[PDB]
Design a protein around this ligand. Structure first.
Ligand SMILES: CC1(C)CN(C(=O)Nc2cnc(-n3nccn3)c(Cl)c2)c2cnc3cc(Cl)nn3c21
Ligand SMILES: CC1(C)CN(C(=O)Nc2cnc(-n3nccn3)c(Cl)c2)c2cnc3cc(Cl)nn3c21
Ligand SMILES: [Ca+2]
Ligand SMILES: [Ca+2]
Ligand SMILES: [Ca+2]
Ligand SMILES: [Ca+2]
Ligand SMILES: [Ca+2]
Ligand SMILES: [Ca+2]
Ligand SMILES: [Ca+2]
Ligand SMILES: [Ca+2]
Ligand SMILES: [Ca+2]
Ligand SMILES: [Ca+2]
Ligand SMILES: [Ca+2]
Lengths: 365, 369
């Protein structure tokens, strides 16, 4: 029987490039792939918009989980490049033009995966190439794609336009389709595209293979808790203001580095006729435009989470970039309230601290 | 809207290697893709077990159909190999070891397709590579300079065992799945198995193209005429016939096209007069061109002949004979239908025989020898 010792996954989606065309596609594709992998018993990390430093720390810690018998999946979506056989994943902080030292190399990660003694390695790259970056003419000089169980997947589109066109739609990502078709148990648009799948398997492996489950393992507890504690969300607060008004502050995870906050009035005393609550004062590291806070749908914040997913009728705020948090997520719930019978509006302020939510816990900036 | 000026396809499936491990997979995959393409309004040729001479003629004549705006699909399944940046399709007569002179080069065919003013080229290869071909040459190339309106697809498995395993099942061809998902506008099952495997799909499209795009039936009337005629001249199947034997017994003799180079023949008694108590009929005397063992003729299912066709597809209650290799027919398909009959009241089994000529069925009508 093929068994997994563990099932671990790291998904990266880069979009918000400083010096390169911004992408949109990754967000959806990471979310849907996360959601698939959860149902296959994977512990997933899902990170949007990483710098070089962030990507390296993330990938290394993924690689540290790949012991003997582990099933490991790595996914990247975003800009990439190719030179002399060597492919590169570009972080959001990379300058223009691309230099190798600003980028993470595919083949290095692949070589590291092949040393680890895993039961299955999966490495899936969905890359936007620059228009005129075709594959180079090369000899093959070095390989490990025999000695360990590998599925390697490499999609390309030439240019951001063709990339975004082919990725348009929900539920439709190339690798999610591949996984569903090939590893359990969207029309061809204009432009230039490529897909490469390569595999070397000594025996049939599938994502659906059972974990060798444990009753009393220290290692398995370690593994579980290392991941689970990187995914602590704040408990919902019922914030009581001095006038008697109660604002519920709720929290949702969207990615390992994205939290939705949402606000609702849950008590209005008879002495108050009208009230509004809003959030402000977020840490500058997280970099929120208040134009994208306090919105009347989660959709308006840029969330994948829709109005049917979250509690309804709130104001919604998306706090992305949690990996950049230095201290605590200190922010302010404000209350505006009008007293019953008066025109007079009062303001009040309640500072909230929620600690280090999600990957912010690691404190690795 | 994109239009095709025509839809033409050539499918080759090579299995019966003389000097190389035999394959089984191609039969099914060619049949099922042929069926799909038929339903999309392609004129299809489907050929099993071609020599180099046969492959070259077929491919060349396929390339002749690729006029302006035509949609052309070439599919190959069987052995391939790689050498110094080139890739090769191996014909069934290929010497061991593989030498380029004996094989058809993928890169040639790809550039021959890209030279045409077609509206869409599709070129799909689904190959076995022998393990020995992994270790002998340093790789360079396999990608290609995929340009024009082209969809290049290229799949490999290392070794016949892994190849056959990955292809086990009906309905489960990688390229059929691909075309259905990616190239039809609409206007589990293939589990990844052991071994070393590769897939490469490349597309270049100046505008959206699909296999479902309607045929523009205007312009280029003589080219259209010739395409249609040439194809249809390669697909004349003989009509079903009733042979009346002089004793009164009626043998039905039916025909089915399995590939452009494979015909099923089937026989049944459709009338026994009351004077005959028992009878049986069989076929014999096929031309030596077609090779066929008489122990593999006269079977009680089409499954027993080696066909894709199951007992659902043809008339039940017959004997079935499969004639492959029709492209090698140098003359007419002449055979004998035999009858054995016992009269009521007699111990005597009488024999009778009738000769049949059905001409040159299917691709044999091209007369290429
Ligand atoms: C939870 C762990 C063990 C940790 N990890 C990370 O990605 N760590 C990470 C570390 N530092 C930064 N950083 N931010 C700022 C600067 N450095 C970042 Cl972004 C991430 C992954 C990654 N993949 C999987 C999979 C499974 Cl299971 N656990 N797991 C983990
Ligand atoms: C019917 C035509 C026009 C012809 N053709 C062939 O394959 N010709 C062919 C010629 N010679 C041999 N041979 N046998 C013995 C020796 N030489 C063989 Cl096997 C085949 C194809 C091939 N593809 C498509 C597609 C559409 Cl439409 N027509 N079409 C045609
Ligand atoms: Ca390049
Ligand atoms: Ca290298
Ligand atoms: Ca650096
Ligand atoms: Ca998508
Ligand atoms: Ca700190
Ligand atoms: Ca006031
Ligand atoms: Ca012509
Ligand atoms: Ca020759
Ligand atoms: Ca070779
Ligand atoms: Ca099959
Ligand atoms: Ca007698």
């Amino acid at each position: 029987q093929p068994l997994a010792k563990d099932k671990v996954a790291l998904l990266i989606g880069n979009m918000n490039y400083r010096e390169h065309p911004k992408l949109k596609a990754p967000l959806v594709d990471v979310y849907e792939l996360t959601n698939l992998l959860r149902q296959l018993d994977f512990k997933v990390v899902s990170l949007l918009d990483l710098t070089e430093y962030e990507m390296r720390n993330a990938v290394d810690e993924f690689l540290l989980l790949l012991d003997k018998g582990v099933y490991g999946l790595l996914y990247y979506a975003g800009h990439g490049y190719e030179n002399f056989g060597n492919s590169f994943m570009v972080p959001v902080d990379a300058p223009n033009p691309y230099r190798s030292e600003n980028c993470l190399c595919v083949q290095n990660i692949l070589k590291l995966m092949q040393e680890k003694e895993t039961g299955l390695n999966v490495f899936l790259l969905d890359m936007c190439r620059k228009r005129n970056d075709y594959d180079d003419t090369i000899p093959i000089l070095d390989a490990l794609k025999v000695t360990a169980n590998i599925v390697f997947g490499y999609a390309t589109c030439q240019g951001a336009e063709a990339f975004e066109i082919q990725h348009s739609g929900l539920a439709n990502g190339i690798f999610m389709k591949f996984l569903k078709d090939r590893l359990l148990e969207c029309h061809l648009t204009k432009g230039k595209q490529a897909l490469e799948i390569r595999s070397s398997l000594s025996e049939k492996r599938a994502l659906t293979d059972p974990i060798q489950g444990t009753e009393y393992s220290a290692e398995s507890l370690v593994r579980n808790l290392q991941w689970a504690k990187a995914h602590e969300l704040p408990e919902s607060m019922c914030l009581k203001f001095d006038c008697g008004v109660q604002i519920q502050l709720g929290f949702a995870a969207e990615f390992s580095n994205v939290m939705i906050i949402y606000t609702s009035i849950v008590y209005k005393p008879p002495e108050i006729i009208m009230c509004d609550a809003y959030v402000t004062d977020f840490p500058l590291d997280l970099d929120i435009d208040p134009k994208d806070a306090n919105k009347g749908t989660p959709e308006e914040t840029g969330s994948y989470l829709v109005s049917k997913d979250l509690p309804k009728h709130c104001l919604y705020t998306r706090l992305s970039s949690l990996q950049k948090l230095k201290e605590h997520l200190v922010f302010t719930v404000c209350l505006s309230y009008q007293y019953s019978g008066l025109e007079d509006t009062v303001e009040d302020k309640q500072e909230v601290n929620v600690g280090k939510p999600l990957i912010a816990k690691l404190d690795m900036h």
